[PDB]
Enzyme design. Structure first.
Site, PDB file in Angstrom:
ATOM      1  CG  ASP A 155      54.918   4.011  83.237  1.00 46.60           C
ATOM      2  OD1 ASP A 155      55.702   3.076  82.971  1.00 46.60           O
ATOM      3  OD2 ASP A 155      55.173   5.205  82.968  1.00 46.60           O
ATOM      4  CD  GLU A 195      53.206  -0.006  83.199  1.00 42.75           C
ATOM      5  OE1 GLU A 195      52.276   0.246  82.399  1.00 42.75           O
ATOM      6  OE2 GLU A 195      54.366   0.432  83.043  1.00 42.75           O
TER       7      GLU A 195
END
EC number: 3.1.26.3
Lengths: 221, 221
Positions: free
Chosen positions: B44, B110
RNA sequence: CGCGAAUUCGCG
RNA sequence: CGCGAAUUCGCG
RNA sequence: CGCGAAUUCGCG
RNA sequence: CGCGAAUUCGCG
């Protein structure tokens, strides 16, 4: 500039473009055309990555539930100021008198690093090592003592006790929805200032109100 | 060819270590202590960085007021899913067939790049290029074309007219903040259902409200 | 369907 | 005002 | 949305 | 006075 050299001396990096370093230190109240705003934006994402990568490597527990709290602290204004203080950033910031504050220092710190990144020819690996050189020791120290962030209720209580030697009062206003997925709404009160908080449980609601009540108390200064 | 190899090719990178790449693709619900939870946590941060660097470099307007909304759309699971199609993660992702949804794909997206990052000896620069190699144009494409925001209100109206022949009613609940940056909070209602929404404008708030009202207008009849 | 209108919402 | 959508009314 | 205006607050 | 945020009214 006699000042930029010092800041560079502390970072262990010399800018190939002094106008870029200077931009990160300049607040909008000094030059409406070239200010740290945009770099601040890039630095936010940059510093975030540096810290998050250090966290997942040195944290005794890798689960999200554990890591989340620590990140909240590590990327907070508070911490950013501690790290900015190792460079005396306030001294080099170019802003209009009486407008400076902790939110500002935190941002120039972010922009500052976005500057190095870009000035080094967007070399991520480089900037990262420079960052760790100056702050890794400090970050691992926070991770080890589990430094988290005080929730809003605790913060509010301290604020209201520092000023009035009193504590806020939470009260239940109403309950609604279904029994399984209930909706709560509590009222945070101190003196005559009031805010409402909504949430899944009485506590979480209170946390919301307290957060709101803290905003309200800020302006009343 | 094997599953992994099939992806490594569409990704343009051959993992030194296979375990890592196959971990990012796993869901706890299959592998008890071998899922992507952690990698996703780093990915992320890693991807938000990759994007932000590209956004603030090619965006027409480099104001935070302008970029902020763009970012939200660029790192949204909604968008990550669109990028994910380039690889069709919904084909290599290991999971108890019957829960794989949109969010999971994002988290895997991610988590994947986090795997690349590590397996590459933690070479942000390398990983970054590999990323732009595949998604640079797509992102740039969306950066300058503009975001066609979703009209939740109209949609919401097309529903209540269909099921009750009655259009919704919006109602302002409060207005806080300084006059140069007011923050509105509106309550959308239909028949006997309620939801709140807040924004920098009434319209904006009305949307954020007609939105939540739809998400809940499907949890009943 | 096409033409003309109304109401509501959205975009321009 | 223009475009679009939804729900109506009229005309062809 | 474009044209013409009012009001409040921010910034030059 | 010019920019910019928000709320409105008239016209197209």
């Amino acid at each position: 500039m006699k000042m930029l050299e010092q800041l560079e001396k502390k970072l262990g990096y010399t800018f190939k473009d002094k106008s870029l370093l200077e931009k990160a230190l300049t607040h909008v109240s000094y030059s409406k055309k070239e200010h740290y705003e945009t770099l601040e934006f890039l630095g936010d994402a940059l510093v975030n990555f540096f810290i998050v990568d250090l966290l997942v490597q040195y944290s005794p527990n890798k689960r999200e539930g554990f890591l989340s709290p620590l990140k909240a602290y590590l990327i907070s204004e508070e911490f950013f100021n501690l790290l900015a203080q190792k460079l005396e950033l306030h001294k080099f910031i170019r802003i209009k008198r009486g407008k400076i504050n902790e939110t500002i220092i935190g941002d120039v710190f972010e922009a500052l690093w976005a500057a190095v990144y870009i000035d080094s020819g967007r070399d991520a690996n480089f900037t990262r090592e420079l960052f760790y050189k100056l702050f890794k020791e400090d970050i691992l120290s926070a991770i080890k003592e589990g430094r988290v962030k005080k929730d809003y209720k605790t913060i509010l209580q301290e604020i209201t006790q520092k000023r009035w030697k009193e504590r806020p009062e939470y009260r239940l206003i109403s309950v609604e929805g279904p029994h399984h997925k209930k909706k709560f709404i509590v009222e945070a009160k101190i003196k005559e200032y009031r805010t409402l908080g909504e949430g899944k449980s009485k506590k979480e609601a209170e946390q919301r109100a307290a957060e709101e009540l803290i905003k309200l108390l800020e302006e009343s200064e």
